[PDB]
């Protein structure tokens, strides 16, 4: 049925690496000393979980992860609080999303509580990698791949679940948010109804690289994902999309696309919606937003802020959109950004223990 | 923007050779030969020299982008031992073309197509006793290209691995008759979308299909009929192209297949079948949209002769039944010969095994 944290076999590294300067860190480039691995087969089920030194995987070249993208991942973070206790943030939501992704991948199910405990054991061993800074954190990358050594397209009879750790630094520079410009070309689609875009399966990402390179060489930084005949705004890069504006009815509104199958249900997205409801200061709407809705609002000076949301950076303000040849300015930064900054402050307060709330777990 | 070169091949022969399988008990994709081709790439130094070496595990940094973001693609083609004992490839330059276009779309580094093909030929030549001694088995060739970027950002890879595996494959049919397949047709799943990568052989197009295939077998079916759009266009069958031999709505006999409008993989077998059928000039050949409604209208109508899938492994695969909206719909493929399917199978097979010449084959 499942591996068990009580069976953990731990092989410590005998040489330890020096830690990076948290302020000089690129996301996903530096790894800690150890990793978690757990093997599965249909014949014997789950093997015992191992923590061992970071090393290459040994994979049969026919492994289905390499041929048919039988893989999924997660992302969550460990935070060194102002009281020096290490916290995780809503990790159970990630365990939930990962399990669902595994079912949809036909990867073997596991006990979410045991995985969580194994990750905590790994973070505990490598806890010195959790930076001494309230603008840096330790990124946790659970990954799950088919290692079926046969070329049939089929449910894997072998798999590997592993966890990597990677320190992540601040996304601010010169004291402020560093806004992004987006490339909006409806020729590309990220996800479609009946597809797998609401799951964190590897398959959804390989096809985005071409569009990202096109964004870059037009001097944008990220892609604005459009969908349907009406050019709905869905996501920004690998982040969920929020729009703070005066809506059609002249009402102040925080809007985000609904979970209708083509939106990844981000943890950050869920938390922001919970905050905004609790505050009760403006309307909170999961609703469709089109490029027309947006360009109209802009002409009528009704847009206050646009930002992405995701684990790594929390929130990411948008300053410009390149669409049908014209550079459209978004006034996010000229408006503070008031709401983006409030959300970043509130989320980080919770993550670093400045505010105690049950969204976090110590250890 | 360079290439590895066949001239530079470094060959490390296996000291211990494995016993070949019985041609008549082969399961696709299960048994591998003694050697493999590997070629390393980096943005810093470009392509390394190609290696032929013993089949062995890959050693990948766990951050490799193939494992996280499906930065990967593959191909599939075959080698055949002819009636004259010469080993042939079939239309391989088409596989090289498709592989190249797949690499571009995946943002993996380009290479020279002729150089890859040549390296594949040297691999096969080394492992040539693995090309089955059988008139209905062949050697399946699996070129694979993966991103091995050791970093978690979603980006164009700065490291990659190109490799090739060889795998004997046997007949799909025995004692002179096809084994037809039944299809599960549920419009809730969508294989591919306009503006997506369904017309490339990128790994990410396949991961999403396991769940539907499992749902198919849990319903007694063997394969998925992939439907698209509000009018339920029939597109592909499993990982095969879809052909329909019928009397069309104008009362003409027609071979029909969905057009290459972005959601269809351009199969080599598909191309060959269309080429043959255009050349025969005995019925109308139409790249055209086909819907579940067209299909069921034609059946209650007795206008359908045959439906079949096409693909490199089995060549052609007759369809006997479709499960759609609770209903089992019989397709009369097997009660109509299946003449056209048998003809295509004989014709392509004759070409592949050298019983007939057409400049569609290359001798090793
Ligand atoms: Mg989309
Ligand atoms: Mg996704
Ligand atoms: Mg969103």
From Swiss-Prot, chain A:
Activity control summary: The branched-chain-amino-acid aminotransferase, activity is inhibited by anticonvulsant drug gabapentin.
Pfam family, one: Aminotran_4
Tissue-level expression: During embryogenesis, expressed in the brain and kidney. Overexpressed in MYC-induced tumors such as Burkitt's lymphoma.
Gene Ontology terms describing biological process: branched-chain amino acid biosynthetic process; branched-chain amino acid catabolic process; G1/S transition of mitotic cell cycle; L-leucine biosynthetic process; L-valine biosynthetic process; lipid metabolic process
Record's GO cellular component terms: cytoplasm; cytosol; mitochondrion
Cysteine pairings via disulfide bonds: none
N6-(pyridoxal phosphate)lysine carried by residues: 200
Names of the cofactor(s): pyridoxal 5'-phosphate
Function: Catalyzes the first reaction in the catabolism of the essential branched chain amino acids leucine, isoleucine, and valine.
Protein name: Branched-chain-amino-acid aminotransferase, cytosolic
Organism expressing this protein natively: Homo sapiens
């Amino acid at each position: 049925g499942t591996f068990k944290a009580k069976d953990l076999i731990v092989e410590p590294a005998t040489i330890l690496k020096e830690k990076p300067d948290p302020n000089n860190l690129v996301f996903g480039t530096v790894f800690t000393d150890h990793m978690l691995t757990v093997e599965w087969s249909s014949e014997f089920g789950w093997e015992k979980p191992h923590i061992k030194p970071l090393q290459n995987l040994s994979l049969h070249p026919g492994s289905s992860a390499l041929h048919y993208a039988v893989e999924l991942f997660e992302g969550l973070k460990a935070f060194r609080g102002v009281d020096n206790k290490i916290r995780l943030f809503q990790p159970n939501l990630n365990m939930d999303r990962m399990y669902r992704s595994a079912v949809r991948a036909t990867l073997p199910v596991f006990d979410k509580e045991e995985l969580l405990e194994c990750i905590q054991q790994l973070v505990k061993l490598d806890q010195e990698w959790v930076p001494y800074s309230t603008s840096a954190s330790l990124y946790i990358r659970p990954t799950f791949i088919g290692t079926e050594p046969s070329l049939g397209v089929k449910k894997p009879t072998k798999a590997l679940l592993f966890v990597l750790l990677s320190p992540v630094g601040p996304y601010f520079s010169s004291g402020t948010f560093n806004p992004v410009s987006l490339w909006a070309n409806p020729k590309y689609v990220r996800a479609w109804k009946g597809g797998t875009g609401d799951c964190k399966m590897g398959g959804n990402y390989g096809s985005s690289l071409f569009a990202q390179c096109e964004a870059v060489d037009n001097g944008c930084q990220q892609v604005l994902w459009l969908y349907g005949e009406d050019h709905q705004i869905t996501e920004v890069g690998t982040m969920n999309l929020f729009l703070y504006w005066i809506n059609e009815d002249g009402e102040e509104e925080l809007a985000t696309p609904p979970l209708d199958g083509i939106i990844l249900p981000g943890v950050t997205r869920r938390c922001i919606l919970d905050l905004a409801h609790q505050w009760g200061e403006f309307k909170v709407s999961e609703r469709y937003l089109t490029m027309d809705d947006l360009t109209t609002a802009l002409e009528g000076n009704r847009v206050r802020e646009m930002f992405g949301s995701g684990t790594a950076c929390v929130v990411c303000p948008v300053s410009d959109i390149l669409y049908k040849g014209e550079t459209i300015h978004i006034p996010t930064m000229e408006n503070g950004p008031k709401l983006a900054s409030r959300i970043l402050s509130k989320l980080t307060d919770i993550q670093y223990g400045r505010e105690e709330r049950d969204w976090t777990i110590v250890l």
